[PDB]
Amino acid sequence: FGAGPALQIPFPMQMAYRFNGIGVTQNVLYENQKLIANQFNSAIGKIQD
Amino acid sequence: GQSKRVDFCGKGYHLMSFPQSAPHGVVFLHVTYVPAQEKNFTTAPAICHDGKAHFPREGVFVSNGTHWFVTQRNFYEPQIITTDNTFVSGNCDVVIGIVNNTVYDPLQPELDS
Amino acid sequence: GQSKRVDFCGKGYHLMSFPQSAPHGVVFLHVTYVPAQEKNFTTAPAICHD
Ligand SMILES: *[C@@H]1O[C@H](CO)[C@@H](O[C@@H]2O[C@H](CO)[C@@H](O)[C@H](O)[C@H]2NC(C)=O)[C@H](O)[C@H]1NC(C)=O
Ligand SMILES: *[C@@H]1O[C@H](CO)[C@@H](O[C@@H]2O[C@H](CO)[C@@H](O)[C@H](O)[C@H]2NC(C)=O)[C@H](O)[C@H]1NC(C)=O
Ligand SMILES: *[C@@H]1O[C@H](CO)[C@@H](O[C@@H]2O[C@H](CO)[C@@H](O)[C@H](O)[C@H]2NC(C)=O)[C@H](O)[C@H]1NC(C)=O
Ligand SMILES: *[C@@H]1O[C@H](CO)[C@@H](O[C@@H]2O[C@H](CO)[C@@H](O)[C@H](O)[C@H]2NC(C)=O)[C@H](O)[C@H]1NC(C)=O
Ligand SMILES: *[C@@H]1O[C@H](CO)[C@@H](O)[C@H](O)[C@H]1NC(C)=O
Numbered sequence: 001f002g003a004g005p006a007l008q009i010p011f012p013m014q015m016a017y018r019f020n021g022i023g024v025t026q027n028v029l030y031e032n033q034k035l036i037a038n039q040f041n042s043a044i045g046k047i048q049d
Numbered sequence: 050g051q052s053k054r055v056d057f058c059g060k061g062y063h064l065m066s067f068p069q070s071a072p073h074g075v076v077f078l079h080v081t082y083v084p085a086q087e088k089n090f091t092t093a094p095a096i097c098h099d100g101k102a103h104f105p106r107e108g109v110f111v112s113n114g115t116h117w118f119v120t121q122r123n124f125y126e127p128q129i130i131t132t133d134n135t136f137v138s139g140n141c142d143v144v145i146g147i148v149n150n151t152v153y154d155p156l157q158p159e160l161d162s
Numbered sequence: 163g164q165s166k167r168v169d170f171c172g173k174g175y176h177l178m179s180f181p182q183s184a185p186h187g188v189v190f191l192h193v194t195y196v197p198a199q200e201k202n203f204t205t206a207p208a209i210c211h212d
Contacts, residue, residue, distance in 0.1 A: 027139070
């Protein structure tokens with residue numbers, strides 16, 4: 001959305017792209033989706049605290 | 050050079066730049082690539098072949114309603130999903146959104162004839 | 163976007179960021195990837211086959 005028209009994508013499928021962008025394959029996110037989501041939520045809560 | 054920094058050298062994916070002298074300054078003409086004419090497709094994190102999960106190597110799985118193709122994420126170039134397009138990373142039990150489809154083997158038809 | 167600049171947007175491999183307005187400023191929440199639970203292995207530059 002910052003380089004042209006906004007192209008919709010599911011958030012897990014976008015986190016897959018952002019994992020690929022750092023050198024980690026897509027299956028790492030897809031197989032550990034629940035753990036990654038829980039870690040993200042816990043990190044946000046700890047930021048608030 | 051070509052910069053990957055977002056919005057550093059123009060709105061869009063930077064292609065190149067041209068300098069021009071101006072009174073007491075410089076003028077950069079930023080030539081950039083902007084996507085256009087979007088189209089909506091049904092997508093899938095992975096495709097479940099026989100007892101295996103296939104993820105696209107460099108691309109994304111889309112569907113035109115009936116068939117499943119693998120394309121590049123920045124330009125609609127649908128390709129038939131084969132073994133060279135994807136890679137196997139286990140079975141179809143841990144991926145949420147895995148879709149049943151056939152991955153065509155590029156070697157077996159030639160070997161059988 | 164996603165930046166490959168080191169330590170520009172957090173300690174680790176940058177994944178994403180979220181802006182939040184604050185009085186007379188902006189607060190970025192940087193979501194990054196950090197390796198953990200390392201293990202030792204024996205490595206080799208190349209492998210000689212036939
Ligand atoms: C989705 O794409 C597939 C593959 O291109 C289309 O199937 C082909 O359609 C063309 C055009 O009618 C036919 O000549 C081919 O014989 C079809 N191939 C097969 C294997 O059936 C399909 O029609 C497309 N679907 C939609 C809804 O556009
Ligand atoms: C994709 O194909 C697999 C083939 O195994 C399907 O899994 C079977 O689904 C049937 C119907 O629900 C069950 O009776 C079988 O027990 C399943 N087999 C196994 C080995 O799990 C799966 O449901 C298909 N997926 C979709 C979305 O249709
Ligand atoms: C990998 O091996 C290194 C040594 O090559 C380990 O480093 C040792 O760490 C212990 C515990 O702190 C120290 O007592 C040793 O003196 C360290 N050795 C050296 C040579 O510095 C390291 O812990 C190993 N890593 C893992 C994850 O097992
Ligand atoms: C395993 O490594 C050894 C050591 O480099 C290789 O043995 C050499 O083989 C060549 C070719 O026959 C001989 O000229 C050398 O004298 C051998 N070296 C020694 C120290 O005996 C061997 O080829 C390697 N095997 C494979 C399959 O790569
Ligand atoms: C389909 O794509 C168009 C652009 O071609 C987009 O504006 C629209 O929101 C999409 N329709 C949906 C998501 O239902």
